[PDB]
C-alpha cells in the first residue's frame, strides 16, 4: 500500500492451452542455455510471469504483420529502416517530455532520410521496453553488482539497489504500456505532421553552428514538401506516421510472459511476442544453440541479430537459415557493428555469402556499438566522426557489391546531452561532464542525431 | 505467503509545477466541498498525487480539441453521440479479451446507428478510468464498508479489502493507460474495419432469436456498404475509427493529479484533464457550488452532467451558465436519466428552458440509470423494454420541440452476461443467476446492446 | 437562295500512312463482301476517307484499354454494363440540351442500377456516331429510297435529300467530335455528380404516377448515399463518372478511315477504331464471312454482336472463336434480342454452348429490338411491359444457369417523347401522336427509362 | 457535297430569349465601334452565326467558374499562371500529332514551373480557337490583302484565298471543338501523368546542348517527385491535369454566336462565352469605349487585356474599373508586353497605380510580342535572350514592389521549328530557313520553351 510505496497485486483468480506443437517448441527453446539472465528466485519469477500473462499487450499481431510487410520492402531495396532511441530507457525518465523528445528526434531524422533515400522510411523506436542490458562483468568498477537495466535492478550505486528484483518485470510492463500509449497518441494526433516536423528541422538549420553546411539540403526538402501541396496531394498521409516499438529481447522471463497466440483468422495460429513489434538478439546472447536464437525461431515477429567483428560468413548464413527458414523477405535483419576502421574489410565477405543463399535480409548498420572508447575525463564516449565513418564504410561496402544498404540503428535522444564527442557543437572531453545522463551507453544528442541524418542522406543521394 | 505481490513505486523526477496563476485558480475551486470522496489520509493522497503528476498522460490535448470539434457537430444536429461500456471497470477484468469485446460491442452499435442516423457517430467508450463510484450508504448488506470501485477499494467482501487505499490511484492509472494503449492499437490496426464489424452484425442477425425482425435493416446496411465499393470510394476511412475514453470524474485526487497544461502552439495553453477525453459529473456530486462542478469549470475537456427526475429547469440553466460560459457548442452535454414512465413529462420543460438561453448543449439520453429495479431472485436488474421505452420517449420529446436528440449513454459489455431482463433472448429472473458479473449496475449484454442499436436506428429513421 | 450553306473542306496535310503489314491485313479483311453499304462513288468515298484519316480522333487508345479492363470485370461477374441512348442520332438534334438530357437519363439509370447491382456500372452511351442504319427494303412507303441515317442521307422525304452523299462522312465526324467534347465536359465538370443525379431521381419519385411504388427503393438509395458522407469517405469519385461512346459499326468507309495505330508505350502498337470506344455489329451485317465481322477481328476495341431469334448455339460459338481468339474476357459481348415471349426458350442453349468454350463473354440483354410492333394509329412502337418482361426472362435464364446477366442495351432519351406504349404514364396509342420524334425506332422516354432502371434494380436484388 | 469539296448545312429548322437586361447590354456593347473586324456580308455572317448558336459549346459554364476560382488564387499570390501555344492555329495543322505536341510542351513547362514556384500552376493553352489575328496594314508586303487567320481567310499567297469568307466561322468552330475533344481526352487518359511528363523533361536534359546547365534543377525535381511516393501520397491527382482553352477574342461575329446563358442554379443567369474558358483583348482592339472591351464587360469569363509600351497608369486603372467592377480577384488579368529594354521602366508606375485601387488583378508577362525584329535573311524573328530578359525584368519589377509576378504568356510549339533565334541550340539567322512554319509570329520551339521554363523557375526560386 501507500505506506510502503507499493501497489499490491493479486496473482490467483485462466489461460488457454497452446497448440501442442507450439508448447513443445517453446519448451524446447527455453530449455536451452541462456546467457545474461537475472538471478532471481524461480518461484518469484513465476508469480510475476503469471501477472504479465494476463495484462493487455503492448502491441497486437496485425501491427506486427503490417510491420513485416513494410520490412519486406526494405529487404527488397524499396524502403529504408531507421531505428533509434535510448540505449537504456529508465523508469525515472519515462515521462511525457522525454518520450515526446525522443519521438520528435526520430521523426526529424526520418524526414531527412525519407527525402535522401527517395523511398519510404520504416521508423522503429528503441522504446517501450528497452529496460534490460547484458554485461561482460558481473562486478562493475565500483565493486557493485553490475546494473543490468531497470527491468532487473537499480542504477543507483548501492548494493541493495543492485539486487535482482523480479517485481521489476511488472514494472517494465507498466512503464512500457504507458509509453506506448503516448507514442500512439502523439503520432496520430499531430506530433508526426510532416510539416511540423520539418519546421523543427528548419529551426535546427537556422541555429546550428554548421547550419550553413546543411542549408542547401534543408531548402531542397522544403521545396519538395511544397511541391506536394502545389500538386494538390498534400493529404491525410502527411499528418501522421507509424512509429514501431523495439527492444533487445534479453530477459526471457519477460518475453515469454508477453507471448500471445494469434486468432488464426489469417493463417494458422502462431506465437507473437507482444511486448514489442520487433526485437533483436545482441552479441552476448546470440549463441547459435542458445535459448535466445531458439526463442526467436518460435515467434512470428520480425527479428534482428547483431553481428560484431568476430562474425564469419558461415555463421551468418547459419543465422539466416535458422531464423528465415521460409525465405520471407524482411523476417530477418542483420545488424552491422564492426567499428569504422573494420567495416570496409569485415562486412563484404559476410554480405556476399548471405546474398548467395537467395534469402533477402535487411542489412542494417549499427555504427555506435563498435566505436566506443573511454575519455581521459573518465566517461564512456564515442566520436561522432567515427560513427559517421562507419555508416560511410557500410554504404561503400554495399555500393561495391550492388546490395541494398537497408538502414541504420542508432542510440539517440531528443535531449541536449553531452555524451558523444564532436558534431557541429564540437562536444569536448571537458564538455562531457555537463549533461552526461545516459544510464548506459553514450547517445547522440538531438542535434548530433539530426546532423547524422543529414550526412547519411548525402550518402543515400551519392 | 498470501497470494499478492507488492510492486514498488517511488522514483519521482522533478517536473516543473503547473503555472502559479492556474494553480491559484485551481486551489480556489477545490476549496469547495466535495461529496463522496475517499477517506484516506491526506499525506498519503499527496504522495500518490505527486506520482501521478509526472506520469505520461492517458490522452493528449489535441485529441480533446478534436473531440470538441466533433461534439460541436453533434450539438448542431449534424452528428450523433454514442457512449457506452461497463458500469464499473475492474482491475482483474482489464484484460485483452474483455477490452476487445467491449470495443467490438460499441463498434457494432455504431455501424447500425451511423446508418440509421445518416450522419457521423462520435464513439466514446466508458473505459480506461471508470474505476470509482458513489454510494448511498456507508454500510452494505454484509455489514461492510461499501465497495467504491477499484480506484478506492476492493470488491471482495472482506474488511481489509474495503479500506480506502490510495495506492489504488496509481494502480488505476497503470490499468487505464494499458487499456487505452490497447484501444488505440485495436482501432488503428483492424478491429474497427467497417466491413469486419458489419460481418459480426450479419452473424447476429443470422443467429438471434429475433433476427428476422432485424434482417431488413441489416440487409439495407449491407447494401449501403456495397454501394460504397460500387462507387469506388477511397476506402481508407472505412478501415479505422476513433474511440474516445470517458469516465465519471469522481475522485478529485485522481483527476487533479492528471491535470496538464497544453503547449503554446494550439491557441495558447489551457488546463486539460488528461486521464480521459471527456468526463461527466454524476447525480450525487453535481452540487452547483461543490468542487466537482467547479473542477469541470476549470478544465478545457468537454463535460457532461447527469440530470435525474429531481432536476428543475432553473438548475439546468445554472449548469449551462457555469459550465458553458463562453457559449461553445458541444462543450456541455446534459444527460437525461428520468425513467421511461417519467421522461415524456419531466424532460420538455428542462429542454425549453435550456434552449432559450441561446447555448447549444448536447441532449443525451441515459436510459438505464433511472430504470433499475430489484428482481424476486435478489438481483439488481433492468428491463430491456423499459430501457428502449425511455429512448423512445426521449426521441418524442425532441421531435415535439424541434430539438436534436443528440445521443445515448448506455452500460454494455461484449460479454454474454445475464444482467438485464428481456431482449430477444428473453432473459428471465431465473436466468440472471447464470452470468451476473457486473461489479455495479446491470449491463446490456452484447446481443442486447446490438438489438438496442437496431431499435434506436428505427427511431432515428422515423 | 435556298436555306443551306456550303462549308468548304479540303486542306489535307500529309500524315504518314498506317504500317504496310497492318494495311496488308486490313485490305485482305475488307475484300470480304459488306452488306448494307452506301452506294456512293468510290472516288468520292476515297477522297472523304482521306480527309478523315488525318483528323483528331474522337477517342484515344488508353481510354479503350481502360474500358477493356472494366469490361473484363463485367465478364467475370463483378460489374454490370449499361448501354443506352438514341436509336438514331441526327445532325439537327445534336444540340447541347439534347445531349445533356441523354447523358442525364443514362446517369439516372446508372445510380439506381449501381445500387441495385451492388457493383460498378460501366456506362456506355449510344452517342457521338450512331448516324447510320440498315434497311430491309430499298424503297419506303413514300416511294423514296430509304433513309439510312445522317451519315448516308437525309431524313426529309425528298429525292434529293435521299441520295447517298459521302460529304456526310465528314459532317458525321464533326458532329461526333463536337458531341464527345461536350460529353467529356459535362461528365467532368458536374453533371455526373452522384448527389445531383440522385436529386433528379428523387424528383421523379415525387412526381411520377407510380412514385409510390419506387419510393422505398429510392429512400434506401438516399440513405446509402448519406451513409457515405456519414462514414467520411473521400468523396472525389462521387463528383464525376465515365461515359463511353459506342455505335453500330456499319459504314465501313467511316470506320476504316477512323483507324489509328496506338503508340509503342502501351504494350506495343495495335489498330484501334477511334471513332468510338466500343462498337457492335448488327443483325443484318454479322455474316460470319462478311467484312463487318472481319473488321471487328482486326481492331483492338471491345466489340459486341447482336443475336436475334434465328441464332444457333453453333454460330454463336463461331463468333466467339473469330472475335475472341485470345480469350480476353470482356473483349466480346453477345447481345441477346429475342423478344420477351422467346427469350426464356431460345437463350439457354446459346449460353450453355458458349460457356462450354472456356471463353468469358459479356451477356447483355437488348430488350427493345425484338419487341417492336405497329400501332393501329400507324406508329412503330414497343410496349413497356414487353421490354421489362424480356429483361426479366433474361435474368431467369442466367439465374438458372449460374451465369452472369451482364448488362442491358436500351434505346432511351432524356426527352419527354411518346414513342413506347405503357410505363407509369400509361402512354396510349392515341398519345403516340403527341411527341413521336425518333428518326428510327421508338425510344423509352426519360421517365420510362428511369422506371425500367428501378424494375431492373429489383431483378438484380432478387 | 463531295464533288464540290463542301459540306451542306441547313440553317432554318429555336432560341430562348435573353433576359431583357442582358439583351440590352449585349446590343449596346456590339453597337460600339469595333476594330479589326472582317469585311464580309452581313447576311452571310448572320446565317453562319445562326448555325453556331445551336452547336454544342466548346466549354461549359461550370468549368469557367472553376477556372475563375483557380485564377483568384493566382491573383492572391498563391498560384502561378502559365499560358501558351501557337501564335496562330491553322486548320491544316489541327492534327493529333500537332495538338498532342503542343499539349506536351505546355505540360513539360508546367512541371518545371510548379516546382520552381512551389505552388499550383494554372495551365491555359492558346488552342481550340486561336484562329484570328489583327493586322496593322490591310495590304501585306506582297500586295495581297493581309492574312488575318483561318477564321477569316487563307494563308496562301493568292488573292482569291485572301478574300474574307464567312464559312470560316463554322470551320473555326468544327476545328476548335475537335481539338478540345482531344485535349480533354489526352489530359484525362495519361498524357498529363506527372511521372510521364517529367520523364520527357529528363530526356531533354540528357540530350540538350545545355543540359548540364539544367541538370541540377532537373534532379531536384525528380527527387521531389520521388519524395511524394516515399511519403505515400503518389495519388490520383498526379495522373491528370486540367488544360484550359484560350484565345484572343477578336472576331465578334464568332464570339457573339458562341454566347450561352447559364442555368441560374448558382446565382442569377449570366452570359458566358463558350468558345473558350478565358479570352483576352489585344493591343489593337482594346479601345476603352470600343466593342471588345464592352463585350468583355458583359461575359462572365475571366478576361485579360494586353498592355503595351504606350499604356498609362491611369488608363490601366480605367480597364480595371470597367472590367473588374465587383472586385473579384482573378476576373481580370493585365498582360505585360513592353519589350525587354523597357519593362523595368514602364511597368512599375502601372503596377503601383493599379495596386492602390484595392483590386487584385493577375500580372502576367508576355515577353515575346514586344521583342520581335526582322532577320537579315528576311524572317520575322525574336531573340531568346530578349525574351528571357523581359521575364527577368518583370520579376525585378514585382520583387521591388512586393507584388506577385503572376504568370507568363508565351507563343510555343511542341514542334522542332526554327523560328526564334538563340537558345541552347543556338538557332542562327541561316538556321531560320530550315523549319519556319508559323502562320504568324515566331514561336519558341519545344526545347526553347522548356529551357525558358527552367530559367523562369530560377527566377521564381530567387
Ligand atoms: N515511471 C515511474 C512512474 C510510474 C509509477 N507507476 C507507473 C505505472 C505506469 C507507468 C508509470 C508509472 C515509476 O515506474 O516509478
Ligand atoms: N506518413 C508518411 C509521411 C510522413 C508523415 N509524417 C512524417 C514524419 C517523418 C517522415 C515522414 C512522414 C510516412 O510515414 O513516410
Ligand atoms: N507464457 C507461457 C506459454 C503459454 C501458455 N499458454 C499460452 C497462450 C498464449 C501464449 C503463450 C502461452 C510460458 O512462458 O510457458
Ligand atoms: N489488471 C491487473 C494486472 C496488472 C497489474 N499491473 C498492471 C499494470 C497495468 C495493467 C494491468 C496490470 C491488476 O491491476 O492487478
Ligand atoms: N471512420 C468512419 C467509418 C467507420 C470505420 N469503422 C467503423 C465502425 C463503426 C462505424 C463507423 C466506422 C467512422 O468512424 O464513422
Ligand atoms: N449539327 C448541325 C450544326 C453543325 C454544323 N456543323 C457542325 C459541326 C459540328 C457540330 C455541329 C455542327 C449540323 O450538322 O448541321
Ligand atoms: N464515379 C462512380 C460514382 C458516380 C459518380 N457519378 C455517378 C452517376 C451515376 C452512377 C455512379 C456515379 C461511378 O462511376 O460508379
Ligand atoms: N482541319 C481540317 C480537317 C477537317 C475537315 N472537317 C473537319 C471538321 C472538324 C475537325 C476537323 C476537320 C479542315 O478543317 O479542313
Ligand atoms: N494535377 C496536378 C499535378 C500534375 C499532374 N500532371 C501534371 C503535369 C504538369 C504539372 C503538374 C501536374 C496539377 O495539375 O498541378
Ligand atoms: N447570339 C445572340 C444573343 C442571344 C440571343 N439569345 C441568346 C441565348 C443565349 C445566349 C445568347 C443569346 C446575338 O448575337 O445577338
Ligand atoms: Cl500450454
Ligand atoms: Cl434575345
Ligand atoms: Mn451504472
Ligand atoms: Mn434501334
CSV table of C-alpha atoms in Angstrom, one decimal, chain B residues 111 114-115 118-120 194 220-221 223-228 230-234 237-238 461, chain C residues 111 114-115 118-120 194 220-221 223-228 230-234 237-238 461:
chain,number,residue,atom,x,y,z
B,111,UNK,CA,-22.4,0.8,-37.6
B,114,UNK,CA,-24.4,5.6,-38.3
B,115,UNK,CA,-26.6,4.1,-41.0
B,118,UNK,CA,-27.5,9.1,-41.7
B,119,UNK,CA,-24.7,11.1,-40.0
B,120,UNK,CA,-21.4,10.6,-38.2
B,194,UNK,CA,-16.3,-1.2,-41.1
B,220,UNK,CA,-30.1,-2.5,-46.3
B,221,UNK,CA,-26.9,-1.6,-44.3
B,223,UNK,CA,-26.3,-2.8,-49.5
B,224,UNK,CA,-25.2,0.6,-48.3
B,225,UNK,CA,-21.7,-0.8,-47.7
B,226,UNK,CA,-21.5,-2.5,-51.1
B,227,UNK,CA,-22.7,0.8,-52.8
B,228,UNK,CA,-19.6,2.5,-51.4
B,230,UNK,CA,-19.5,0.0,-56.2
B,231,UNK,CA,-18.9,3.8,-56.4
B,232,UNK,CA,-15.2,3.3,-56.0
B,233,UNK,CA,-14.9,5.5,-52.9
B,234,UNK,CA,-11.3,5.8,-51.4
B,237,UNK,CA,-11.6,5.9,-43.7
B,238,UNK,CA,-13.5,2.7,-43.6
B,461,UNK,CA,-35.3,6.7,-39.3
C,111,UNK,CA,-27.4,5.4,-60.0
C,114,UNK,CA,-25.3,0.7,-59.3
C,115,UNK,CA,-27.2,0.5,-56.0
C,118,UNK,CA,-24.2,-3.6,-55.6
C,119,UNK,CA,-21.3,-3.4,-58.0
C,120,UNK,CA,-19.8,-0.9,-60.5
C,194,UNK,CA,-23.8,11.4,-57.8
C,220,UNK,CA,-32.9,3.3,-49.5
C,221,UNK,CA,-30.5,4.7,-52.1
C,223,UNK,CA,-29.8,6.5,-47.2
C,224,UNK,CA,-27.0,4.7,-48.9
C,225,UNK,CA,-25.7,8.0,-50.1
C,226,UNK,CA,-25.9,9.7,-46.8
C,227,UNK,CA,-24.1,6.7,-45.2
C,228,UNK,CA,-21.1,7.5,-47.4
C,230,UNK,CA,-21.6,9.8,-42.6
C,231,UNK,CA,-18.5,7.5,-42.9
C,232,UNK,CA,-16.4,10.4,-44.1
C,233,UNK,CA,-15.4,8.7,-47.3
C,234,UNK,CA,-13.2,10.8,-49.7
C,237,UNK,CA,-15.0,9.8,-57.0
C,238,UNK,CA,-18.6,10.8,-56.4
C,461,UNK,CA,-31.7,-7.6,-55.8
